[PDB]
Design a binder for this molecule. Structure first.
Ligand SMILES: CCCCCCCCCCCCCC(=O)SCCNC(=O)CCNC(=O)[C@H](O)C(C)(C)COP(=O)(O)OP(=O)(O)OC[C@H]1O[C@@H](n2cnc3c(N)ncnc32)[C@H](O)[C@@H]1OP(=O)(O)O
Ligand SMILES: CCCCCCCCCCCCCC(=O)SCCNC(=O)CCNC(=O)[C@H](O)C(C)(C)COP(=O)(O)OP(=O)(O)OC[C@H]1O[C@@H](n2cnc3c(N)ncnc32)[C@H](O)[C@@H]1OP(=O)(O)O
Ligand SMILES: Cc1cc2nc3c(=O)[nH]c(=O)nc-3n(C[C@H](O)[C@H](O)[C@H](O)COP(=O)(O)OP(=O)(O)OC[C@H]3O[C@@H](n4cnc5c(N)ncnc54)[C@H](O)[C@@H]3O)c2cc1C
Ligand SMILES: Cc1cc2nc3c(=O)[nH]c(=O)nc-3n(C[C@H](O)[C@H](O)[C@H](O)COP(=O)(O)OP(=O)(O)OC[C@H]3O[C@@H](n4cnc5c(N)ncnc54)[C@H](O)[C@@H]3O)c2cc1C
Lengths: 607, 607
């Protein structure tokens, strides 16, 4: 019971703030109503708090063991029992397309449900992403491959995404794994891939679908020359699904990691043990990097949501501790050393810390759910009035923030959660130090923060001609320009919005200067990550303020009890964030406006 | 070689070329320790740290200490005990020990530089070795009879602990309930349970351990002022010859499972609970416990800060080495060209930004701890600063919560940039950075949490000091500012100084206003930690600018080769720090100037 959920805040976002319930019971969501949506959330949260979180500690303390002769890993029993609970509930098929056995839902609800698993035992969701991959394979496959995809979903096959080599991590286009075409149309895959999550998974599944990037013999260089291949761990009867002889793809190593230990991260050898790794060209077209980005987009969304889920339970653990921990006198009585001892929530620094954890946790939850409301054309239309093309671009804009800003913030603020526990925070008896360790990776896999910030600026703004960015900017301007109990917050958001506008203009300026002085492009890189974090801070403060506006209406209408307390908390968090976090963007804008290339010209030997 | 990467060059630069500690070497107390010998000592202990000490860094974490309930002892991994012996066989546990106890006299600035190397390589190894230094503190505070015991303890190399914390008394030391009962023969029986005691047992490293234990005599008043300090040895011993005798009634009952620093056994210590009394001797035969124990706390706080700084340094240098060799991607000037030559990642602006962020904070932090150390000796303070003994003590006291709190928080925060530089490989235990991060998370907790550091800095080291020490340091900064390649840095430092002045005035106002409005004091708590961090950033920027000013002189004087590269890097770091770190203090002042008590008035249930 390390895991502390927050269904109340999820439902508040989904229904009171974004109005996702407007599509429930109609059109694609004809057979799922708002009441059923709430029950699913409570139901998955109960499961996550119980059987899923049961093995969170066991997975870390008793991690998988590799047998190098069998090329298999053994997972701890308790974690396998949590996996079966997940499957027994159909939760690995939430959001899956109906024709694959799934229950149709808005993506905003899907990610709200997944948050609970990510918070309770994130590696369990990763192992359980096979059906989601089946659906992507289906959408990209031939009619015949669609039959395989349908079999794989029904049988709950696991799956991996196989890009990375020792020399090709961020630079995916540098991969050397080759594909050799056979007369009958299959391919033989030959190479060694690195850091593959779930490349083996004990006996959780009867098969694993490896989606592998490889370069066909004679194809061009870079990512443009790569193709994507279905490489099953086991050959199988293409009609019935029956498992056949082992295919030539074997795990040859399993890493020892800082955290996320129960997730087997593996070296994957294809065609190196005298058995060919047969692969099938996905969709029988050569378009690998584009096809795989369907998968990368899901991964990046999941990692951000993972980081955010972990910070939320980190905060709630710190809050529960602080409420019961007696230490010291009220500061108003610090001189009187017979004064009553007080619980530490009375101390200002603890309150500063708890409100920092809360505002960022709840602001990040708003960000990923907001992002998810642009992931269905029909929800984007109903809740935002935006057509499908703009909705896809806005979602593409927000993904590197969910991932990049979410991962970095969660990890940083978990520092505060741990500090709230004092020395006990450093003990394994409490979950926070594992939160920190499990979440450090989120800034690295699915593309590093620097790669996130590069994607945001060059592809999601510049190549987009700023359309999505402009749309979101306009929604922030509209909120600022609309009671008067939010006057200070709106003034602080106006400055923050102008600051982010300034950063954007400055970075664009550097880019166009690179028409004349190539070296000027470096300034964009120097400021890329700070720009991303600034936008994320802006979105958090804006969405918190929106939440405060709804909380004010509900308090004015007569909210009582725990509702009153909740809405009061939203008002305090939006105000705190605007006064304590947003002003720093002014300084960041001025730093970005004065970047120079001194640090680039410096001799490497001077570091 | 090892995980540990030393920087003797930066240390010697700080001691000799910047602070001029050598001006006192070779004369008076340091009569028989010349500059050449000091350099040789730094080189020698650095090699010990890089070899035998660092050799068991990983082992101590992967094969951690075990508690044996059969004997109430702790057993340590063999590889670590061997490192400890390398340290004793060289005499490095007598680093800055008084001469009459067998030490070599040396300036504290040199002592802490020597210790930095052990703290970088295997910090627990130094903590276990703090016994001789505790003997010296027992000597200074003890009776004439006890001076003989402490001398015996130093000569035999007995271990030592500082025993304050209880389950209900951590930050609030004064709330401890452990109890001292005076006996007819003038000894005391100590009765109680102390928690989280570092080195409470240590296998067979030593023939005795001296527990220095705070306890409340029956009948004494409340709080810390009612506490006395007691010498409680693990074994009774002959007070004249030192022969080890009967076991004393102080036993370890438990060893904590921690995020990091695993090889440092952290134990529940029970006194008088296992059927034989814990006999203790009133230190100095006076009742002055919390003042006496603070002689020890001061050393512990300096050690933790230096430790955090030591760990950030070797973290940075591991990251830098990795970046120099890792090929990934094309140069940003050739982004579009997917045929462009691949480059090492030091060519990437974000990596260069990350490295210079690590460099400037690591080297800035080293300057701070060594600058602080030049005020710990009256002779050094006079010779290098021209300040007398009283002002030197107040300045040192002002700077300790900076070394500890700002050093603690900064090291852990920037190791994130170190780990990010390795990409996905930073998450592997194969590289030392994830352990650096785990080992240093505690630095913000033990020896007083960051919040306690901040309260001490403001309430005791500034307000009670009536700002004398603070005004002296501010005067040194202003002097450097008033004095042309360093014009911009001076202008940015001038802004930063004004910013910190503002924060000081605003928090003092909040405090003084509390006489008419009690709740006003909360705004001091709300801002105290941010104020501490700002002063830390200001000192880093100032000292780095001082270093660049010396580097300019040396380059103008004709430096070449490796020296030139080093001096160039000092110029780049100072400028980068001034332009990228210091401006954020402007926004922090404005946030501090607008603090309110909304977060204090909010109902706990709205969190
Ligand atoms: C849901 C199913 C999951 C099944 C099992 C998995 C469960 C386990 C979860 C494990 C979690 C994390 C695992 C991982 O880390 S997998 C490996 C992740 N690697 C990366 O993220 C790569 C990081 N590096 C980059 O992103 C680089 O910037 C890169 C894009 C590789 C640079 O290559 P490039 O210079 O060649 O790219 P370029 O800009 O020119 O575009 C080339 C084509 O790539 C497509 N593309 C690029 N960027 C995007 C984005 N953001 N979104 C969609 N598509 C993108 C485009 O096709 C582009 O072509 P065009 O420019 O002509 O359109
Ligand atoms: C070198 C030998 C080491 C051998 C041991 C080997 C192992 C070491 C390695 C282990 C590393 C971890 C070590 C630990 O964690 S030990 C536990 C550390 N605990 C703390 O640091 C306490 C944190 N909390 C505080 O500091 C509180 O602020 C405290 C002061 C305790 C609050 O109590 P209070 O309200 O009663 O304090 P007050 O402000 O009124 O002052 C009371 C008296 O305390 C003395 N004092 C207080 N502060 C200082 C400082 N900075 N410096 C010196 N003395 C201080 C004063 O005597 C004061 O009396 P006066 O006000 O009349 O002067
Ligand atoms: C636990 C774990 C699981 C993983 N699972 C999978 C998986 O299942 N499938 C898979 O395909 N991959 C997987 N990965 C790979 C992961 O996506 C890569 O580690 C990641 O993209 C970073 O690449 P790298 O490790 O080679 O680091 P590098 O690319 O070498 O990064 C080194 C440093 O240089 C920086 N850098 C590199 N190129 C640039 C550039 N052009 N501009 C600016 N900075 C740059 C990086 O930001 C980083 O700081 C996993 C990684 C981990 C840690
Ligand atoms: C690895 C380790 C080794 C240790 N070794 C030793 C040892 O050898 N000897 C020893 O005596 N102790 C030792 N300690 C004890 C350590 O010093 C305490 O854990 C520390 O002082 C914090 O106390 P606590 O754990 O009770 O936290 P708490 O005092 O309960 O604090 C919890 C939270 O409340 C905050 N807080 C508490 N009081 C106040 C206040 N008045 N105002 C504002 N915020 C407040 C803290 O900052 C923290 O965020 C060790 C601790 C650890 C983790």
């Amino acid at each position: 019971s390390h895991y502390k959920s927050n269904v109340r805040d999820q439902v508040f976002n989904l229904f009171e703030v974004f109005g996702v319930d407007k599509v429930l019971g109609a059109d694609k969501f004809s057979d799922l109503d708002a009441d059923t949506a709430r029950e699913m959330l409570t139901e998955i949260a109960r499961l996550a708090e119980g059987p899923i979180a049961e093995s969170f500690v066991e997975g870390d303390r008793n991690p998988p063991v590799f047998d190098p002769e069998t090329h298999t890993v053994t997972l701890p029993e308790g974690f396998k029992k949590s996996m079966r609970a997940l499957f027994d509930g159909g939760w690995d098929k939430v959001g899956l397309a109906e024709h694959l056995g799934g229950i149709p839902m808005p993506r905003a609800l899907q990610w709200a449900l997944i948050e609970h698993i990510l918070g309770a035992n994130p590696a369990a969701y990763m192992y359980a992403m096979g059906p989601g991959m089946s659906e992507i394979f289906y959408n990209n496959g031939t009619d015949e491959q669609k039959k395989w995809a349908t079999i794989a979903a029904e049988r709950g096959w696991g799956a991996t995404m196989v890009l990375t080599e020792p020399d090709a991590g961020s630079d995916v286009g540098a991969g050397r794994t080759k594909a050799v075409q056979q007369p009958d149309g299959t391919w033989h895959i030959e190479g060694v891939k690195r850091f593959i999550t779930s490349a083996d998974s004990d006996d959780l599944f009867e098969n694993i679908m490896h989606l592998v990037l490889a370069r066909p013999e004679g194809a061009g260089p870079g990512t443009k020359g790569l193709s994507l291949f279905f490489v099953p761990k086991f050959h199988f009867d293409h009609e019935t699904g029956e498992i056949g002889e082992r295919n030539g793809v074997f795990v040859t190593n399993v890493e020892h990691k800082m955290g996320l230990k129960v997730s087997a991260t593996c070296e994957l050898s294809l065609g190196q043990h005298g058995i060919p790794a047969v692969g099938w060209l996905v969709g029988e077209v050569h378009n690998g990097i584009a096809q795989m980005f369907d998968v990368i987009e899901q991964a990046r969304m999941m990692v951000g949501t993972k980081a955010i889920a972990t910070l939320s339970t980190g905060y709630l653990n710190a809050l529960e501790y602080a409420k019961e921990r007696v230490q010291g006198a009220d500061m108003t009585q610090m001189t009187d050393k017979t004064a009553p001892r007080v619980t530490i929530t009375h101390h200002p620094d603890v309150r500063r810390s708890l409100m920092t954890q809360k505002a960022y946790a709840e602001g990040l939850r708003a960000i990923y759910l907001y992002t998810a409301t642009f992931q269905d054309a029909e929800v984007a239309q109903a809740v935002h009035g935006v057509d499908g093309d703009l909705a896809a671009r806005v979602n593409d804009l927000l993904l590197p923030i969910v991932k990049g800003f979410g991962s970095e913030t969660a990890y940083a603020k978990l520092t505060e959660s741990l500090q709230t526990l004092g020395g006990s925070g450093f003990l394994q008896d409490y979950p926070i130090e594992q939160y920190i360790r499990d979440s450090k990776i989120d800034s690295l896999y699915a593309g590093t923060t620097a790669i996130q910030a590069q994607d945001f600026f060059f592809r999601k703004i510049i190549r987009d001609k700023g359309q999505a960015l402009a749309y979101v900017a306009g929604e922030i301007e509209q909120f600022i320009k609309n009671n008067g109990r939010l006057k200070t917050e709106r003034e602080l958001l106006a400055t923050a919005l102008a600051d982010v506008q300034g950063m954007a203009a400055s970075l664009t300026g550097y880019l166009m200067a690179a028409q004349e002085d190539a070296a000027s492009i470096y300034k964009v890189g120097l400021g890329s990550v700070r720009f991303l974090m600034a936008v994320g801070d802006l979105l958090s403060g804006w969405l918190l303020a929106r939440q405060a506006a709804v909380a004010i209406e509900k308090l004015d209408a007569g909210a009582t009890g725990a509702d009153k307390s909740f809405y009061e908390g939203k008002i305090a968090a939006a105000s705190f964030f605007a006064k304590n976090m947003l002003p720093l963007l002014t300084s960041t804008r001025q730093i970005i406006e004065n970047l120079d290339n001194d640090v680039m010209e410096l001799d490497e030997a001077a570091f």
